[PDB]
DNA sequence: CGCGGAACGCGCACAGCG
DNA sequence: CGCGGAACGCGCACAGCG
């Protein structure tokens, strides 16, 4: 009912920690262990998980493959999302080649407008003009990796929204404007850099 | 409240960007309501985000704000950067043409024999074993882009070398001494955040 | 007229159950 | 015995003033 987004980010962290624990053969963990690895209090963990259910065992703890399964469900990773990359520049090309996507995310789109790229056969696929967006997105692409130069970002967004996209992972440094019907998440490395600058200059604060 | 919420610093970064665009458009005067509009926040928050540092208001001269903001964020100096992990991302970052005058790449490290010794925009790749010799006095921030499984270790090495801040791109929670700052850029996390958001539209 | 404190909404102790 | 509600604390109202 409450469900702060700060909690969704932490759930991501717990699932990753669970995958890792599983990889090490651990069968059972606890909020205390989980907190120690996610660098938060055990309270924060139990409270974050409580927003969705009671997956543990009182007096005992949490069975790793169970909670793991439960978090993947909540996070909507128990499905196979359709992805497309708009802006086959350098970052987008690195992305196309990222091997750590896993079962939950599948690349189906590849786009851009530059003639010198359009038509290049990328990893399992081929680039194409962003004009084919209206005829590519519906029912096959839900999420788009927006990676274009800061000035083409807002333009590319409109296009994507019109083509029926449901989510935009924005890599461009700028606040996008989209219908509130479309979810957007920013991945801003320059903002992070700037934050590091500030953090350094203000050690006390940090 | 003399203690600045960190969320306010994300907004200042956004304000600065909005100013640069203005200046670039030729505008000379802006307002609380104008900034908010462009930043999608209330004019209140803008004023509040600014009050933590001063009264730059008359008011609000784009160039006087752009300048005070970059001073507040520490962009008024030339930070030294290095990249640890020269794979696809490390390479992409190495050739990024938009750091600006505030961030300078002075190092590129790795362990792959095929990569070290390799020339790059701004220098050459060197083995991480050389960080203790390359960091002090020249490099404050490190762009960490190694595989997930080697992140912590690379981080342990940067710490040992005396690094001030790590911009972590690996999907892991780095463990570092308190005097070392860490900022994460997690796109897999954004992806999974979007996944959740799509399924919980009323939650929005 | 137009544009730099304080209230308010939201993010630990014990009850519950194995 | 061992490990899933409510207090606390962080993030609008008006005064000044051209």
Short mmCIF file of C-alpha atoms (C1' of nucleotides) in Angstrom, two decimals:
data_model
loop_
_atom_site.label_atom_id
_atom_site.label_comp_id
_atom_site.label_asym_id
_atom_site.label_seq_id
_atom_site.Cartn_x
_atom_site.Cartn_y
_atom_site.Cartn_z
CA UNK A 1 0.00 0.00 0.00
CA UNK A 2 2.84 2.37 1.00
CA UNK A 3 5.66 1.12 -1.28
CA UNK A 4 8.30 3.79 -1.71
CA UNK A 5 10.40 3.51 -4.77
CA UNK A 6 13.53 3.60 -2.65
CA UNK A 7 12.31 0.11 -1.74
CA UNK A 8 12.13 -1.09 -5.29
CA UNK A 9 15.78 -0.25 -5.81
CA UNK A 10 16.68 -2.14 -2.64
CA UNK A 11 14.68 -5.18 -3.77
CA UNK A 12 16.85 -5.21 -6.84
CA UNK A 13 19.85 -5.32 -4.58
CA UNK A 14 18.42 -8.16 -2.47
CA UNK A 15 17.66 -10.32 -5.51
CA UNK A 16 21.22 -9.84 -6.78
CA UNK A 17 22.53 -10.81 -3.36
CA UNK A 18 20.26 -13.88 -3.40
CA UNK A 19 21.51 -14.96 -6.85
CA UNK A 20 25.03 -14.66 -5.50
CA UNK A 21 24.24 -16.59 -2.30
CA UNK A 22 22.59 -19.31 -4.37
CA UNK A 23 25.65 -19.49 -6.59
CA UNK A 24 27.60 -20.23 -3.42
CA UNK A 25 25.32 -23.02 -2.44
CA UNK A 26 23.68 -21.16 0.40
CA UNK A 27 20.21 -22.38 1.07
CA UNK A 28 19.05 -20.18 3.87
CA UNK A 29 19.72 -16.60 4.84
CA UNK A 30 18.23 -13.96 7.13
CA UNK A 31 17.33 -10.28 7.08
CA UNK A 32 20.46 -9.68 9.17
CA UNK A 33 22.64 -11.38 6.57
CA UNK A 34 20.79 -9.69 3.77
CA UNK A 35 21.15 -6.32 5.32
CA UNK A 36 24.86 -6.80 5.88
CA UNK A 37 25.32 -7.44 2.18
CA UNK A 38 22.99 -4.77 0.90
CA UNK A 39 24.45 -2.42 3.47
CA UNK A 40 21.17 -1.65 5.22
CA UNK A 41 19.57 -2.55 8.52
CA UNK A 42 17.79 -5.90 8.94
CA UNK A 43 14.76 -3.76 9.69
CA UNK A 44 14.94 -2.12 6.36
CA UNK A 45 14.98 -5.53 4.74
CA UNK A 46 12.03 -7.04 6.53
CA UNK A 47 10.10 -3.85 6.02
CA UNK A 48 10.89 -3.80 2.28
CA UNK A 49 9.74 -7.39 1.85
CA UNK A 50 6.63 -6.84 3.96
CA UNK A 51 5.16 -4.54 1.32
CA UNK A 52 4.46 -7.59 -0.77
CA UNK A 53 4.19 -10.59 1.46
CA UNK A 54 5.48 -13.00 4.07
CA UNK A 55 8.00 -15.16 2.29
CA UNK A 56 10.19 -16.17 5.18
CA UNK A 57 9.91 -18.63 8.06
CA UNK A 58 9.70 -17.19 11.57
CA UNK A 59 12.31 -18.27 14.02
CA UNK A 60 14.29 -19.55 11.05
CA UNK A 61 14.81 -17.17 8.19
CA UNK A 62 14.50 -17.01 4.42
CA UNK A 63 15.06 -19.91 2.05
CA UNK A 64 17.23 -18.45 -0.72
CA UNK A 65 15.60 -19.99 -3.79
CA UNK A 66 12.13 -19.06 -2.45
CA UNK A 67 12.74 -15.41 -1.72
CA UNK A 68 14.74 -15.26 -4.97
CA UNK A 69 11.73 -16.59 -6.80
CA UNK A 70 9.44 -14.18 -4.95
CA UNK A 71 11.51 -11.08 -5.71
CA UNK A 72 11.81 -11.93 -9.40
CA UNK A 73 8.01 -12.08 -9.40
CA UNK A 74 7.50 -8.76 -7.82
CA UNK A 75 10.11 -7.10 -9.96
CA UNK A 76 8.37 -8.52 -13.01
CA UNK A 77 11.41 -10.47 -14.07
CA UNK A 78 9.41 -13.66 -14.32
CA UNK A 79 8.46 -12.64 -17.84
CA UNK A 80 10.28 -11.81 -21.01
CA UNK A 81 10.28 -8.12 -21.84
CA UNK A 82 10.79 -6.79 -25.35
CA UNK A 83 13.60 -4.29 -25.72
CA UNK A 84 14.76 -1.93 -28.42
CA UNK A 85 17.74 0.39 -28.62
CA UNK A 86 17.29 3.78 -30.14
CA UNK A 87 20.54 5.46 -31.03
CA UNK A 88 23.13 3.02 -32.28
CA UNK A 89 25.92 5.20 -31.28
CA UNK A 90 28.73 3.98 -29.14
CA UNK A 91 26.73 3.33 -26.02
CA UNK A 92 23.90 1.70 -27.86
CA UNK A 93 26.40 -0.50 -29.69
CA UNK A 94 28.01 -1.45 -26.38
CA UNK A 95 24.54 -2.28 -25.10
CA UNK A 96 23.65 -4.41 -28.15
CA UNK A 97 26.69 -6.38 -27.19
CA UNK A 98 26.02 -6.63 -23.50
CA UNK A 99 25.85 -10.35 -22.62
CA UNK A 100 24.43 -9.93 -19.13
CA UNK A 101 20.81 -9.23 -20.03
CA UNK A 102 19.54 -12.65 -19.03
CA UNK A 103 16.23 -14.36 -19.68
CA UNK A 104 14.05 -11.44 -18.57
CA UNK A 105 15.13 -8.95 -21.25
CA UNK A 106 15.34 -9.51 -24.99
CA UNK A 107 16.65 -7.20 -27.67
CA UNK A 108 14.27 -6.89 -30.53
CA UNK A 109 14.75 -3.32 -31.61
CA UNK A 110 17.68 -1.49 -33.01
CA UNK A 111 17.23 1.91 -34.49
CA UNK A 112 18.73 5.19 -35.53
CA UNK A 113 18.44 7.68 -38.46
CA UNK A 114 21.98 8.00 -39.62
CA UNK A 115 22.27 6.46 -43.07
CA UNK A 116 25.77 5.35 -42.29
CA UNK A 117 24.52 3.02 -39.62
CA UNK A 118 21.04 2.09 -40.74
CA UNK A 119 21.34 -1.35 -42.26
CA UNK A 120 24.27 -2.59 -40.23
CA UNK A 121 23.73 -6.12 -38.91
CA UNK A 122 24.15 -5.83 -35.14
CA UNK A 123 24.14 -8.68 -32.61
CA UNK A 124 21.29 -10.95 -33.67
CA UNK A 125 19.52 -8.35 -35.74
CA UNK A 126 19.83 -5.33 -37.89
CA UNK A 127 19.62 -1.63 -37.51
CA UNK A 128 16.76 0.26 -39.03
CA UNK A 129 15.35 3.72 -39.40
CA UNK A 130 13.21 5.12 -36.59
CA UNK A 131 10.45 5.60 -39.09
CA UNK A 132 9.52 1.94 -38.67
CA UNK A 133 8.78 2.56 -35.07
CA UNK A 134 5.01 2.63 -35.48
CA UNK A 135 5.25 -0.75 -37.18
CA UNK A 136 7.72 -2.41 -34.78
CA UNK A 137 6.90 -1.43 -31.26
CA UNK A 138 3.33 -2.71 -30.80
CA UNK A 139 3.27 -6.11 -29.22
CA UNK A 140 6.96 -6.73 -29.49
CA UNK A 141 8.73 -3.89 -27.77
CA UNK A 142 7.70 -2.66 -24.39
CA UNK A 143 10.87 -1.00 -23.29
CA UNK A 144 13.22 1.31 -25.04
CA UNK A 145 16.85 2.10 -24.37
CA UNK A 146 17.14 5.70 -25.25
CA UNK A 147 20.72 6.53 -26.15
CA UNK A 148 20.94 9.54 -28.35
CA UNK A 149 22.78 12.90 -28.09
CA UNK A 150 21.28 15.30 -25.55
CA UNK A 151 19.65 17.35 -28.27
CA UNK A 152 17.88 14.51 -30.08
CA UNK A 153 16.54 12.93 -26.79
CA UNK A 154 13.21 14.72 -26.38
CA UNK A 155 12.51 14.25 -30.10
CA UNK A 156 13.22 10.51 -29.95
CA UNK A 157 10.93 10.21 -26.93
CA UNK A 158 7.87 11.59 -28.70
CA UNK A 159 8.44 9.24 -31.57
CA UNK A 160 8.67 6.33 -29.18
CA UNK A 161 5.57 7.31 -27.32
CA UNK A 162 3.64 7.61 -30.52
CA UNK A 163 4.84 4.16 -31.63
CA UNK A 164 3.28 2.61 -28.51
CA UNK A 165 6.22 2.17 -26.14
CA UNK A 166 5.49 1.50 -22.50
CA UNK A 167 8.84 2.37 -20.98
CA UNK A 168 11.84 4.51 -21.60
CA UNK A 169 15.27 3.95 -20.10
CA UNK A 170 16.78 7.37 -20.73
CA UNK A 171 20.49 7.73 -21.11
CA UNK A 172 20.34 11.29 -22.26
CA UNK A 173 21.11 14.03 -19.72
CA UNK A 174 17.82 15.91 -19.63
CA UNK A 175 14.37 15.60 -18.23
CA UNK A 176 12.13 14.01 -20.81
CA UNK A 177 8.56 14.97 -21.33
CA UNK A 178 6.14 12.09 -21.83
CA UNK A 179 2.54 11.25 -21.16
CA UNK A 180 2.21 10.10 -17.54
CA UNK A 181 1.10 6.89 -19.24
CA UNK A 182 4.65 6.12 -20.05
CA UNK A 183 7.20 5.14 -17.48
CA UNK A 184 10.66 6.65 -17.58
CA UNK A 185 13.86 5.93 -15.71
CA UNK A 186 17.08 7.83 -16.02
CA UNK A 187 20.52 6.38 -16.14
CA UNK A 188 22.73 9.42 -15.88
CA UNK A 189 26.44 8.88 -15.55
CA UNK A 190 27.33 12.53 -15.78
CA UNK A 191 24.93 13.32 -12.95
CA UNK A 192 26.70 10.64 -10.92
CA UNK A 193 30.07 12.20 -11.71
CA UNK A 194 28.87 15.57 -10.63
CA UNK A 195 27.52 14.04 -7.48
CA UNK A 196 30.92 12.58 -6.83
CA UNK A 197 32.47 15.99 -7.19
CA UNK A 198 30.11 17.37 -4.57
CA UNK A 199 30.59 14.36 -2.27
CA UNK A 200 34.32 14.85 -2.32
CA UNK A 201 34.16 18.53 -1.59
CA UNK A 202 31.82 17.96 1.18
CA UNK A 203 33.25 15.03 3.13
CA UNK A 204 31.53 16.03 6.42
CA UNK A 205 28.19 16.00 4.66
CA UNK A 206 28.84 12.70 2.92
CA UNK B 1 17.93 23.35 7.08
CA UNK B 2 21.74 23.66 6.95
CA UNK B 3 21.96 19.92 6.08
CA UNK B 4 21.29 19.57 2.36
CA UNK B 5 19.20 16.63 1.31
CA UNK B 6 21.11 14.71 -1.35
CA UNK B 7 18.07 14.62 -3.59
CA UNK B 8 18.49 18.40 -3.81
CA UNK B 9 21.86 17.93 -5.41
CA UNK B 10 20.38 15.86 -8.18
CA UNK B 11 18.04 18.73 -8.83
CA UNK B 12 20.80 21.35 -8.90
CA UNK B 13 22.57 19.29 -11.52
CA UNK B 14 19.34 19.40 -13.48
CA UNK B 15 18.98 23.13 -12.91
CA UNK B 16 22.49 23.79 -14.19
CA UNK B 17 21.74 21.83 -17.35
CA UNK B 18 18.58 23.80 -17.91
CA UNK B 19 20.53 27.01 -17.56
CA UNK B 20 23.13 26.03 -20.03
CA UNK B 21 20.35 25.42 -22.53
CA UNK B 22 18.86 28.81 -21.75
CA UNK B 23 22.10 30.67 -22.07
CA UNK B 24 22.60 28.78 -25.33
CA UNK B 25 19.16 30.03 -26.39
CA UNK B 26 20.15 33.57 -25.45
CA UNK B 27 17.91 34.04 -22.46
CA UNK B 28 19.20 36.26 -19.74
CA UNK B 29 16.59 36.19 -17.00
CA UNK B 30 14.69 33.27 -15.54
CA UNK B 31 12.39 32.70 -12.60
CA UNK B 32 11.56 30.21 -9.90
CA UNK B 33 8.46 29.16 -11.87
CA UNK B 34 10.44 28.95 -15.12
CA UNK B 35 13.07 26.62 -13.70
CA UNK B 36 10.54 24.38 -12.07
CA UNK B 37 8.61 24.12 -15.30
CA UNK B 38 11.65 22.93 -17.11
CA UNK B 39 12.78 20.68 -14.30
CA UNK B 40 9.31 19.35 -13.51
CA UNK B 41 9.32 20.51 -9.90
CA UNK B 42 7.61 23.27 -8.05
CA UNK B 43 8.99 26.75 -7.93
CA UNK B 44 9.06 26.14 -4.23
CA UNK B 45 11.51 23.35 -4.40
CA UNK B 46 13.70 25.33 -6.74
CA UNK B 47 13.88 28.19 -4.25
CA UNK B 48 14.42 25.73 -1.46
CA UNK B 49 17.15 23.87 -3.34
CA UNK B 50 18.85 27.22 -3.83
CA UNK B 51 18.43 28.54 -0.29
CA UNK B 52 20.67 25.79 1.10
CA UNK B 53 23.56 27.61 -0.55
CA UNK B 54 22.66 31.27 -0.86
CA UNK B 55 20.59 34.13 -2.24
CA UNK B 56 21.55 34.34 -5.86
CA UNK B 57 18.30 35.94 -6.54
CA UNK B 58 18.45 39.43 -7.95
CA UNK B 59 15.90 37.84 -9.82
CA UNK B 60 17.90 35.04 -11.21
CA UNK B 61 20.35 35.89 -13.92
CA UNK B 62 20.93 32.82 -16.00
CA UNK B 63 24.67 33.37 -16.17
CA UNK B 64 24.89 34.24 -12.57
CA UNK B 65 23.01 31.12 -11.62
CA UNK B 66 24.81 28.80 -14.04
CA UNK B 67 28.01 30.07 -12.48
CA UNK B 68 26.98 29.81 -8.83
CA UNK B 69 25.61 26.31 -9.44
CA UNK B 70 28.74 24.92 -11.06
CA UNK B 71 30.67 26.42 -8.19
CA UNK B 72 28.42 24.68 -5.69
CA UNK B 73 28.76 21.33 -7.52
CA UNK B 74 32.53 21.65 -7.75
CA UNK B 75 32.58 21.88 -11.53
CA UNK B 76 34.63 25.01 -11.08
CA UNK B 77 37.84 22.92 -11.11
CA UNK B 78 39.48 20.27 -13.26
CA UNK B 79 38.90 16.77 -11.85
CA UNK B 80 41.23 13.96 -12.86
CA UNK B 81 39.57 10.72 -13.99
CA UNK B 82 40.75 7.24 -14.93
CA UNK B 83 38.93 4.25 -16.20
CA UNK B 84 39.41 0.81 -14.73
CA UNK B 85 38.08 -1.83 -17.10
CA UNK B 86 38.66 -1.05 -20.75
CA UNK B 87 36.03 -3.33 -22.29
CA UNK B 88 33.13 -2.09 -24.44
CA UNK B 89 31.91 0.36 -21.80
CA UNK B 90 35.38 1.39 -20.70
CA UNK B 91 36.23 2.10 -24.33
CA UNK B 92 32.96 3.89 -25.06
CA UNK B 93 33.53 6.09 -22.02
CA UNK B 94 37.15 6.74 -23.02
CA UNK B 95 35.94 8.28 -26.25
CA UNK B 96 32.97 10.11 -24.87
CA UNK B 97 33.23 13.69 -26.20
CA UNK B 98 31.20 15.49 -23.55
CA UNK B 99 32.96 15.52 -20.20
CA UNK B 100 33.73 19.18 -20.53
CA UNK B 101 36.56 21.16 -19.01
CA UNK B 102 35.73 19.94 -15.49
CA UNK B 103 36.68 16.27 -15.98
CA UNK B 104 39.94 15.07 -17.49
CA UNK B 105 40.90 11.49 -18.24
CA UNK B 106 44.47 10.87 -17.11
CA UNK B 107 44.52 7.08 -16.97
CA UNK B 108 43.10 3.88 -18.38
CA UNK B 109 43.78 0.61 -16.62
CA UNK B 110 43.14 -3.10 -17.09
CA UNK B 111 44.72 -6.57 -16.71
CA UNK B 112 44.02 -8.17 -20.09
CA UNK B 113 47.39 -8.58 -21.89
CA UNK B 114 45.74 -7.74 -25.23
CA UNK B 115 44.53 -4.40 -23.88
CA UNK B 116 47.40 -3.10 -21.88
CA UNK B 117 49.97 -1.13 -23.80
CA UNK B 118 47.17 -0.26 -26.15
CA UNK B 119 46.95 3.41 -27.13
CA UNK B 120 43.78 5.35 -26.51
CA UNK B 121 42.27 8.76 -26.82
CA UNK B 122 44.19 10.65 -24.16
CA UNK B 123 46.96 8.15 -23.48
CA UNK B 124 47.51 4.42 -23.12
CA UNK B 125 46.16 1.47 -21.18
CA UNK B 126 48.19 0.41 -18.22
CA UNK B 127 48.07 -2.56 -15.87
CA UNK B 128 46.12 -1.89 -12.66
CA UNK B 129 49.26 -2.76 -10.73
CA UNK B 130 50.36 0.73 -11.67
CA UNK B 131 47.53 2.58 -9.99
CA UNK B 132 49.50 3.18 -6.76
CA UNK B 133 51.92 5.02 -8.99
CA UNK B 134 49.46 6.90 -11.07
CA UNK B 135 46.75 8.01 -8.77
CA UNK B 136 48.23 10.13 -5.98
CA UNK B 137 48.10 13.78 -7.00
CA UNK B 138 46.67 13.16 -10.48
CA UNK B 139 43.51 11.09 -10.25
CA UNK B 140 40.59 11.70 -7.89
CA UNK B 141 37.79 9.81 -9.54
CA UNK B 142 37.71 6.41 -11.08
CA UNK B 143 35.13 5.16 -13.53
CA UNK B 144 34.76 1.51 -12.48
CA UNK B 145 33.52 -0.65 -15.33
CA UNK B 146 34.91 -4.14 -14.74
CA UNK B 147 32.81 -7.33 -14.74
CA UNK B 148 30.57 -7.82 -11.77
CA UNK B 149 32.72 -10.50 -10.24
CA UNK B 150 35.88 -8.36 -10.18
CA UNK B 151 34.34 -5.07 -9.02
CA UNK B 152 34.99 -5.28 -5.29
CA UNK B 153 38.59 -6.28 -5.95
CA UNK B 154 39.18 -3.46 -8.40
CA UNK B 155 37.60 -1.17 -5.79
CA UNK B 156 39.93 -2.49 -3.08
CA UNK B 157 42.86 -1.65 -5.34
CA UNK B 158 41.64 1.87 -6.15
CA UNK B 159 41.09 2.56 -2.45
CA UNK B 160 44.62 1.38 -1.71
CA UNK B 161 45.87 3.71 -4.44
CA UNK B 162 44.26 6.68 -2.70
CA UNK B 163 41.29 7.37 -4.88
CA UNK B 164 38.69 9.93 -3.69
CA UNK B 165 35.63 8.72 -5.55
CA UNK B 166 34.40 5.75 -7.50
CA UNK B 167 31.71 5.98 -10.15
CA UNK B 168 30.57 2.35 -10.01
CA UNK B 169 28.95 0.86 -13.12
CA UNK B 170 28.91 -2.71 -11.79
CA UNK B 171 25.66 -4.20 -10.45
CA UNK B 172 27.16 -4.71 -7.04
CA UNK B 173 27.30 -2.88 -3.79
CA UNK B 174 30.91 -1.90 -3.32
CA UNK B 175 32.34 -2.05 0.20
CA UNK B 176 34.71 0.92 0.70
CA UNK B 177 36.23 2.89 3.59
CA UNK B 178 34.05 5.78 4.63
CA UNK B 179 36.43 8.43 3.34
CA UNK B 180 35.86 7.16 -0.20
CA UNK B 181 32.78 8.33 -2.07
CA UNK B 182 30.77 6.04 -4.31
CA UNK B 183 28.13 6.75 -6.91
CA UNK B 184 26.43 4.04 -8.88
CA UNK B 185 25.17 4.16 -12.45
CA UNK B 186 23.05 1.02 -12.67
CA UNK B 187 21.17 0.59 -15.96
CA UNK B 188 20.14 -2.99 -15.22
CA UNK B 189 18.53 -1.49 -12.09
CA UNK B 190 16.72 1.14 -14.17
CA UNK B 191 15.51 -1.65 -16.41
CA UNK B 192 14.12 -3.61 -13.57
CA UNK B 193 12.63 -0.39 -12.19
CA UNK B 194 10.87 0.13 -15.45
CA UNK B 195 9.66 -3.44 -15.44
CA UNK B 196 8.05 -2.89 -12.05
CA UNK B 197 6.60 0.47 -13.09
CA UNK B 198 4.95 -1.02 -16.11
CA UNK B 199 3.18 -3.58 -14.05
CA UNK B 200 2.13 -1.23 -11.38
CA UNK B 201 0.68 1.66 -13.46
CA UNK B 202 -1.74 2.78 -10.80
CA UNK B 203 1.16 2.76 -8.41
CA UNK B 204 2.53 4.67 -11.41
"C1'" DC C 1 1.91 44.16 -7.23
"C1'" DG C 2 5.51 40.16 -8.29
"C1'" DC C 3 9.10 37.15 -7.00
"C1'" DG C 4 14.11 33.49 0.74
"C1'" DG C 5 11.04 29.06 9.38
"C1'" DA C 6 7.38 25.87 10.21
"C1'" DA C 7 3.87 22.52 9.15
"C1'" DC C 8 3.18 18.27 7.07
"C1'" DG C 9 3.34 13.84 4.71
"C1'" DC C 10 6.09 10.01 3.87
"C1'" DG C 11 10.06 6.76 4.30
"C1'" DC C 12 11.99 0.70 16.26
"C1'" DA C 13 9.78 -2.24 19.72
"C1'" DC C 14 7.30 -5.91 20.10
"C1'" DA C 15 3.60 -9.00 18.47
"C1'" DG C 16 3.12 -13.28 16.04
"C1'" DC C 17 4.17 -17.57 14.90
"C1'" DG C 18 7.40 -21.36 13.66
"C1'" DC D 1 12.89 -19.65 22.51
"C1'" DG D 2 14.40 -17.20 17.54
"C1'" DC D 3 13.53 -14.43 13.55
"C1'" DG D 4 6.10 -9.39 10.23
"C1'" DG D 5 1.75 -0.88 13.70
"C1'" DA D 6 3.31 3.38 15.18
"C1'" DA D 7 6.79 6.82 16.48
"C1'" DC D 8 10.33 9.40 14.65
"C1'" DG D 9 12.58 12.52 11.59
"C1'" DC D 10 13.96 13.77 7.03
"C1'" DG D 11 12.62 16.10 2.84
"C1'" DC D 12 3.31 25.79 2.62
"C1'" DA D 13 2.73 30.40 4.66
"C1'" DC D 14 4.36 34.99 4.95
"C1'" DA D 15 7.87 38.27 5.39
"C1'" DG D 16 10.84 41.49 2.94
"C1'" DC D 17 11.17 44.71 -0.63
"C1'" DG D 18 11.84 46.81 -5.29
#
